[PDB]
Structure formats: C-alpha cells, structure tokens
Design an enzyme around this catalytic site. Structure first.
Site, PDB file in Angstrom:
ATOM      1  CE  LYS A  88      -2.669   1.702   5.249  1.00  0.00           C
ATOM      2  NZ  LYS A  88      -2.885   1.150   3.893  1.00  0.00           N
ATOM      3  CB  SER A 132      -0.976   0.008   1.204  1.00  0.00           C
ATOM      4  OG  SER A 132      -0.220   0.107   2.396  1.00  0.00           O
TER       5      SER A 132
END
Ligand code: BO2
Ligand code: BO2
Lengths: 587, 133, 133, 128
Positions: free
Chosen positions: C92, C49
């Site tokens: 996140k 990611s």
C-alpha cells in the site's frame, strides 16, 4: 457465585502412582447394557441386527469377541452341484459328507438330499463340469462361522466365475462372504454397502435368496439357482451411516434389531476398573497413576465430571503414545505428557494468534474497564477446537428500538447467532417499557472477526455490553463471558466450556497474569468444568477466578462491580440512560 | 388371530388381544387397526422369542418395551440434560408468558418432548414476532 | 449497494455508522445522509482496511474540512473509533509512493497507517531513502 | 517416496504372458518396496488418483491387490501383515478432504506441522 478451587477440582486422587495394575479383562460390551441386550435378543431369535455408534468406539472388536463365545450345530457342508451343463444350485448336506461323494461321484444312493437325476447318454450318444463343488466345510459350531467383510463389493459378497480358456462350469465358481457365513454371522459396514453400490443386490440376497457369482463383460454362462439363505447379518456403522439405509423401508424390514452404543459411560469405580483390565488385556504395562490419568482424560473428553468417554479406540491410541514417552511403561507422567504433546503438535494457530495479540495486531484488553466492551469467547472451527477471547463492542445512540447485529447484517453470523440477538431484543424491549418502545439503537460488533460465527453462547456477553452502553457502565475487561440467554434474562448452558475458559487463561497468561482475571459462565455448566491442571492451580493460587451465574443481571453486577438495586445501583443508571436517550430523541 | 396361527405362531388369547390393541395404537385411532400384517408379524416374532416360543400377553408387552428401550438412547440423553439443568424446563409452579409446548422428534420412533416456549410483550405497533421463524 | 463491495467491506461501513451515530448524539439521531464512493472502481472490492479513510472522509464532509490530498490512508476502525491493523502494508505504502513519484514528488506526500502495523513495515530501499531525504 | 499414488504404483501389477498368469508375473508396487521402512505419499495425489479408500484397506485390513485387467481369470491374493510407516505430505488445505474422514485421524495420529515463518535471528541467518 464464586467457584472455589475445591468446587472446581474434579480429578481422581492417585495413591501409589507407580504400582503395577493387575486386573482381569472385562466382558465384551461392558458399560453398554443396551447394545448387548439388543444383540442377545437378535442372537436368540435369528434376527438380523445393526450395531450403531460413533467412530472409534471399538464396536467391531466388541462384536467379534462377543461372537467367539457363541456356539451352534456344526455347519452343513456347502456345495454347488450341476443340474445341467449350463446350470447350478447351492446344496447343504449333513457335515463332513462331501469328501465322500467327491469319489462316489468319481466312480465316473445314500446321500439322499443330493437328489438332482440329473446326471444321466455319453454312451447313449458318445457325447464327450460334473464333479460337485465344495465351497466350505468345518468341524464344530464353536465358534460359529464369523465372517467380517469390510469391503462389500459384489465379488466379495457373492463370489466369482473364473473362465479357463472360453468355458466355465460348476467347478470354476468361487464362494464370496455370503457362502462362508452360512450357519453363522456375516458382518458388513453400512458405509461400504452404500459406497460399493451393493445395497440392492444385498437385499435381493436376503429377501429373495438371489446370490449370483460375478461374471465378465465373453461369452455365455450358468443359471445359478437361488438358495434358502442361512445366516445372521450384522451391519456396523455410525448413526449417520444408517441414514442412507433408513430411507429405505426395506432396511427396517430386514434389520429389526438396533444395537446402539452410548458415546459415554457412567464415570464409576467399576468402569475405571474395567478400563484398567481392558488395557492390560490389550498388552499395556500399566501403573495405577497411568490408569487414573487415562480414566480422568476420558471424563474430560466427555466434558462431564460424571461420565467418561466410551471410545476405547481413542483411549488406547493415547495410551500408545504415552507408552512410548514412558519407555514402555504407562504412568501418570507419560499420559499427562502424551496429552501435552498432542496439544503442542496442534498449537501453531494459537501460537500465531498469541503472538498477533502480543504485538497489538489483534487488539484485546485483559485489564482495566471500558464501557460497552466485553471479552466474549469462541471456539475455533477446526480440531482440536481451541478457545479464544473475541472482543465485542456495543454502542448506543438515540433511535427507535433497533438492536443491530453488525455481524449478522454483514452475512457473518448464522441462524442460531441471529436467534440469540432476536431473543435479546425480546428481553430488552419487554424489560424497559417506561418510555413506550425503547428510545435507542444499539449496535453490536465482534471487533476483529473476519469469518462466519454461529451459536447462541455470546448472548450473555452481548446483553451485558448493550446494558452497559445504555447505562454508561464501565465493565471489567479482566473477566471474559460466555452464556446463552433466554427472553426472561435467564442464563443457559453453552458448549466447549473447558476450551473457552482455558483459552482466556492462555491469553491472560501470554499478556502477564494480573491476579484478578477469570471467566463468568452458566451455573448450568458446573458439571461440565473439567479444567486442565494449570487453570485449577491458578484458581487455587488466587491468580484466576470463575464465576457462575443464573441470570444476566448477576453477570452485569459482577462486571460493573455494583448491585442492580440497593439504589445507587445499576438499574437506576440504566433507567437514567434510557431517559437521556428518550429526551435526545425529541428536539 | 387365524392369520397368525396359519403363519405358525403358538398364540394365546392374551397375546392376540395385546397384538390387536398394539395395531390400534399403531394406527393412533381407537376405532381402527393398522393393516400392515408384516409389521404385526415382525413384532410377534420378537414376542415369541421372549415368551420361549409362546405368544402371550406378557411377551408382546415386553417385545414392545424392548423396542422402545433399544431406541431410547436420545431420550436417555435428553432426560439426563433436563435433570442436570443443562436443558432448562419447569414442570411445576407458575410463570407469566411461559408454557411447555410439545414436539416430536424428527427421527423414528418419533419420541415426544416438552419444549419451553416464552412470550414477551412490550408497547409497540401490532407486531407478532416469531423469533424462530 | 451496487454489489461491488464484499461482506467484510460492508461490515466496516456498518461499524462506522455505529461509531458516528453513537459519538454525535446532541440532535437525537444523526441529521445527515452520507454517501461514500470509490470513484473509479469497476470491480468487486473487499476488506475493512478502508474504514479509516471512509470515516475521515465522512467527518470532513460533515464539518466542511479540507483534507490534504498528498497523504493516502489505510487502517480499519472499530466502533469506538480506534484504528486497527491492516494487511499488505508494504504494497500500500509503496504503491502510493509510485503514483507520487510518476506525478513528480512534491516533498510533502506520504501515508497515514495503523500504529498497530509498525512491525510489518519492511519498506523497499527507494521509499526509505525518500523518507530519509 | 511415490509422488504419483495410482493403484498400480501403490499396489503392484499382474502381467499376463499369453492367457495365463501365476505367482511369478506379479510385480511389486510402492507398498511392497517400503516394507521394514517408510512409504511417503502426497495427500493430494491420494485424493486426485481416487486411491484413498483402497489405501485405507491396505493399512486397516492388510488388503494389497496387484492391479488386474478388464480377460480372463486370476489369482486370489492373500492379505498380509503390513510392515511400514507411512508419512503423508501436503498443505493444511490438502488434508481437509482427508480429515472429513474419521478413518484419517485414526490412521494418521501424528501431525508434523511446519511454521510458515521462523524467528529472524542470527542463528537462522547462519543456518540459511
Ligand atoms: B458459543 O459456543 O455458541 C459461541 C458463540 C459466539 C462466539 C458467536 N460459538 C462458537 O464458539 C462457535 C462454535 C462453533 C464451532 C464450529 C462450528 C460452529 C460453531 N465458533 C465459531 O462460530 C467460530 C467460527 N469460526 C471461527 C471461530 N469461531
Ligand atoms: B406439532 O405437531 O405441529 C409440532 C409443532 C411445534 C413443535 C412446532 N410439530 C412437531 O412436533 C414436529 C413434527 C415433525 C416431525 C418431523 C418432521 C416434521 C414435523 N417436529 C418438529 O418440528 C421437530 C423438528 N426437529 C426436531 C424436533 N422436532
């Protein structure tokens, strides 16, 4: 070549679906000529034998029925008598004769085999455990003794000493399976011998006649004399279960007769009819429709139009479920519906996958065109083995004949997977030599793959993607691909071809069927297409298409919608990409 | 021959020759015979059943054949996959950079099979690439 | 190279490479050595990611392009330079918000993330207010 | 529902009133109590207590042996026709030890799989 509906249809036509089936029970071992003729031999010769075959084939049920038909001289009576106050031996008389002598002794001669003296001094010395012990007896050798002991522990095989508080004597010794099988057959599972640790004691029983009743860790005991063993042992297990056994030279010495079941039978009217009488003899109420649907599910299980799966226990388990859905009647519908319910009960992971694909969390195309992109097809590791499309990308840049498998470099691809990539490389390098070594670095990736993958069946998809990337050839995204390739660019057979086709169909259908989707696959796999009804209808409807190919370039012509030659063809566009890349590569 | 009779077999000259020649073939040497008397007896035991108690040439060639049949499922599969073109093999014509090499299957009784082997040559820098290796 | 990144992490870097090499071909092979580091990372890291962040940083370094530091990034990339869905998207975003807030919110901070992850944004109240504000 | 699948709990026990023993010193385990109904065991416990193979033998062969002690002698206990439905409970992972065994899918044909999430609908909000 295009595969029409008529070419793909494999199912047995049903006439008079609801009619009750009426058929006689087939013999034990039908369809299994090899294992029956090995066992007949072992029976004719007194040899010990082993019955080998995959799980759920019905090997124990067939063996026990076949053994029931046999006939031997009635087994001798079987006893332990004392040779002393601390010693015993196993004895055979002629039959019925120890109900006598229990009392003839009981006067506490003829019976001439019952020799050992050895009783004979309790008046010579007034010294204050002597009556013989009947283990077994029976009235005929028809059926012969048949002892199947699934749990092969030392007490179960060899018998036990009890101690009535301590002493013990002849009459406290209990028989195990080995005693009960004398004059007949003892059946043990190879897995149990290994798991219970009883393989070496068992050899000693067969090689040396040592059969010791189990004692306890306390105070003293009996010498037990070894006797001449009189029995045929059949071991049962899978090809794999015998592998622990077979590292031992004593195993092939003792079990000379291998009786191996085939995992599949020929798919013939005779085996369909055998299956039908076998089901009725199991108690099902069966209709012609239910019988055809079960026989055709057995062919699809086998992944072969020409063979049926031989596993009778699996076929029954599915008919058990169908029978509940049919209210007790085994019909075509009940069987197609038992099939569907099994898939539903295992379909959560696909229901997740489909939803992630619909939300664009997994990025897949099932329409349009793109360069260097292809839907390859994989089968999910856990049962029941659902197939899915896996997006595969190739990118080409100027460089020095490197074919880069990203998945293989990141540790996700196996050795066979790696071998396919090496083989593609071999094909490319050798097929395109005008510039010397290939002026390109190609990289191949399975775009959303997070796990280890293995197998050669994406070789075709990889090689078309690479050729597309070299030549800037847009490929249809509505067609998925599976196939291995050899170094000569020939397409080779792959596994799980039903699950692969069907899993692309399922992704096409959840995204809305465009009318032109389908799968390109090895011509070599035609005889393994036994596709589900929904796919065959879609192909019949013009809404799904199957193409079978023999060569990698045939697949590329289909996906690029052009011919390799007829020259504004593909081969000249490949050569032009390569010339372009060869010039970029020298400033 | 005298060892077999002293074991109890009823043996004929034919059965004896076929057993002695099976022992040579076991040894894979025309000049030597396999010394394993227990294996030779186990095979004569099976022959003796097929000969109705008599150890004959036929009973021995047929005991041999029955052993192969009883272990032949994996070959029967392999042959059928070859006939269906699931395994791709040529046994006629010509081709460049292709050869039938021959391998022996790991598990007893060690059946042999052809294995298609391909070589491809391209311009490059003295590399011999064994893909399998 | 130092043994801190996993196989999936490595795969993302390989895939970026694939994108760069193939997207910028005028000079032949790419005339640059790029090095990427997670500056204060002392432990093993894994996952794809960070592919987007890595590829923007590399493009910036090639082109000498100043990048906003007030925006954090998550996203995987495929070889075609398409941004793909990533996990833990709430944690996140929120963790960047928390670092922005402890340093004093400048008014222009935020996060760039996959369009593919819209249906996974279920952000805490404090972040939604800050976006509304 | 027996969460703790040890051999005495599943199969029962012999007590010895000082030694002898006889019919009337045999205590039932969970398998006896579930006859004519449902026995529920956790897949993790079968593996952890080591009782998976004895349990198969109970279901495949009707062998249900009350537990004895290491002392002096005992009773042959005849195998009976088992009359019960077993439901095992566990995570996708707990069944993986089980599923390497072809006997497992043979005995437990019906998989009942929970979804980890539901649709977020007014009907499920109301159910909650
Ligand atoms: B093909 O059949 O060779 C294909 C090749 C391609 C996808 C890399 N392979 C697979 O479908 C394999 C089959 C397989 C299943 C189980 C164990 C080993 C091989 N599947 C996968 O590699 C696979 C692995 N993990 C998840 C999903 N698929
Ligand atoms: B030759 O005899 O050296 C030949 C070489 C060629 C096929 C690579 N080798 C084999 O035939 C070997 C013999 C062998 C058997 C068993 C163990 C080790 C070697 N056979 C194979 O390598 C083999 C291995 N697996 C399946 C089939 N064949």
């Amino acid at each position: 070549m295009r595969l029409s509906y008529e070419a793909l249809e494999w199912r047995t036509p049903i006439e008079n679906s609801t009619e009750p089936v009426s058929l006689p029970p087939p013999p034990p071992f039908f369809g299994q000529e090899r294992a029956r003729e090995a066992l007949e031999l072992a029976i004719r010769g007194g040899f010990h034998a082993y019955l080998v075959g995959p799980p759920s084939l019905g090997k124990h049920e067939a063996l026990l029925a076949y053994l029931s038909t046999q006939s031997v001289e009635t087994p001798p009576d079987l006893l332990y008598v004392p040779l002393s106050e601390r010693k015993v031996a196993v004895l055979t008389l002629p039959s019925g004769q120890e109900i006598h002598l229990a009392e003839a002794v009981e006067g506490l001669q003829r019976f001439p085999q019952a020799r050992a003296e050895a009783l004979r001094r309790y008046a010579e010395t007034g010294e204050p455990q002597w009556r013989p012990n009947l283990l077994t007896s029976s009235s005929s050798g028809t059926p012969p003794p048949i002892v199947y002991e699934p749990y092969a522990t030392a007490p179960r095989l060899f018998g036990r000493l009890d101690y009535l508080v301590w002493s013990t004597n002849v009459s406290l010794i209990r028989p195990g399976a080995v005693h009960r099988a004398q004059g007949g057959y003892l059946i043990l599972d190879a897995l149990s011998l290994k798991r219970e640790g009883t393989w070496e004691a068992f050899k000693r029983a067969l090689r040396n006649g040592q059969v010791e009743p189990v004692t306890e860790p306390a105070p003293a005991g009996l010498e037990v004399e070894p006797f001449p063993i009189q029995m045929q042992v059949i071991l049962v297990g899978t090809p794999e279960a015998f592998e622990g056994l077979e590292e031992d030279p004593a195993f092939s010495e003792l079990f000379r007769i291998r009786a191996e079941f085939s995992p599949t039978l020929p798919a013939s009217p005779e085996n369909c009819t055998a299956l039908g009488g076998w089901l009725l003899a199991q108690g099902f109420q069966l209709t012609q429709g239910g019988l055809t649907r079960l026989y055709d599910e057995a062919r699809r299980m086998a992944e072969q139009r020409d063979r049926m799966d031989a596993r009778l226990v699996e076929i029954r388990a599915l008919a058990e479920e169908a029978a509940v859905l049919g209210g007790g009647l085994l019909t075509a519908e009940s069987v197609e519906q038992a099939i569907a319910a099994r898939e539903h009960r295992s379909f959560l992971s696909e229901e997740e996958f489909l939803r992630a694909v619909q939300e664009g969390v997994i990025r897949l195309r099932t329409t349009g065109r793109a360069v260097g992109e292809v839907n390859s097809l994989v089968v999910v590791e856990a049962a029941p083995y659902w197939g899915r499309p896996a997006r595969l990308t190739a990118r080409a840049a100027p460089g020095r004949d490197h074919l880069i498998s990203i998945d293989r470099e990141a540790g996700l691809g196996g050795q066979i997977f790696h071998k396919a990539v090496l083989t593609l490389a071999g094909y490319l390098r050798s097929r395109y030599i005008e510039h010397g070594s290939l002026p390109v670095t190609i990289s191949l990736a399975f775009e959303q793959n997070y796990v280890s993958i293995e197998g050669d069946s994406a070789g075709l998809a990889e090689l078309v993607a690479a050729l597309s990337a070299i030549g800037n050839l847009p490929l249809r995204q509505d067609l998925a691909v599976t196939g291995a390739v050899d170094q000569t660019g020939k397409v080779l057979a792959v596994g799980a071809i039903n699950a692969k086709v069907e899993g692309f169909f399922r992704v096409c259908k959840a995204l809305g069927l465009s009318g032109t989707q389908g799968v390109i696959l090895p011509e070599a796999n035609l005889a393994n297409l036994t596709l589900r009804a929904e796919v065959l209808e879609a192909v019949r409807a013009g809404q799904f298409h199957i193409y079978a190919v023999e060569t990698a370039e045939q697949a590329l012509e289909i996906l690029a919608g052009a011919r390799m030659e007829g020259f504004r063809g593909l081969q000249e566009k490949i050569r032009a990409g390569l010339e372009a890349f060869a010039r970029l590569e020298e400033g």
